[PDB]
Design an enzyme around this catalytic site. Sequence first.
Site, PDB file in Angstrom:
ATOM      1  CB  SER A  32      -0.929   0.016   1.215  1.00  0.00           C
ATOM      2  CB  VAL A 175     -11.703   1.871  -3.306  1.00  0.00           C
ATOM      3  CG1 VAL A 175     -12.488   0.584  -3.043  1.00  0.00           C
ATOM      4  CG2 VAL A 175     -11.156   2.430  -2.011  1.00  0.00           C
ATOM      5  CD  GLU A 178      -7.383  -0.936  -3.228  1.00  0.00           C
ATOM      6  OE1 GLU A 178      -6.196  -1.264  -3.015  1.00  0.00           O
ATOM      7  OE2 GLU A 178      -8.125  -0.464  -2.347  1.00  0.00           O
ATOM      8  CG  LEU A 204     -16.188  -4.993  -0.307  1.00  0.00           C
ATOM      9  CD1 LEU A 204     -17.712  -5.117  -0.303  1.00  0.00           C
ATOM     10  CD2 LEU A 204     -15.768  -3.852  -1.226  1.00  0.00           C
TER      11      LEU A 204
END
Length: 230
Positions: A32, A175, A178, A204
């Site tokens: 990240s 988001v 990715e 999620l």
Amino acid sequence: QQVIKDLFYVVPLSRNCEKIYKNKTHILLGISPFNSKFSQNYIHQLIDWSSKNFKNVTVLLAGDEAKNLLEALGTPTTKAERKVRKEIRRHFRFSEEALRKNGREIDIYTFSDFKNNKIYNEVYQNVIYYFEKDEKFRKSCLAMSHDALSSRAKSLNMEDIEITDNMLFHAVKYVLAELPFFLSGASILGYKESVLAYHRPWKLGEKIKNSEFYIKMSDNQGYIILKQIN
């Protein structure tokens, strides 16, 4: 080194993720951007442990939309683009050093490197479709966006900032770009199966595994949490 082989304890997202992990076919290491966890030493640990355990290793770095995370937290586009380029070059350097040390192919990509890949594009279109049409999925993606901005706010020392909706909708472009690798990284890259590996739970994903959306993970895709224990 048995120390290297046991550098991480693995927590699978689901029982299917555990089976794919135990097959050891392929690991995709998610690095990240703008996250102090990913020092040179930690990236070496990830790759050293991966090289002892998995048949195939790939490193995933942030693509173009990483600049959105900075633009949301008070960076003009010019400085944001330069900071992304510098961060990706450093991640690449550290990753390449450790892969080379292990006699491994330098298999490193950003999530922007697949715009000519039909699997990436079709999963991305699905993600965008349900972001627009399923409020429940949209809410979960915006929460991932909130997580990414809250972490960097603390990290770039800016916790006094209110995270606005316009901030969330700008950062959610990261988001959405990715997510195809979370859902279908093995099929995008061309491995029979794969686990994406990261040091934090993916809420999620827990919902996707609970069959809460028309968005699904591919049957050959898993997610693992990498913990370090004494």
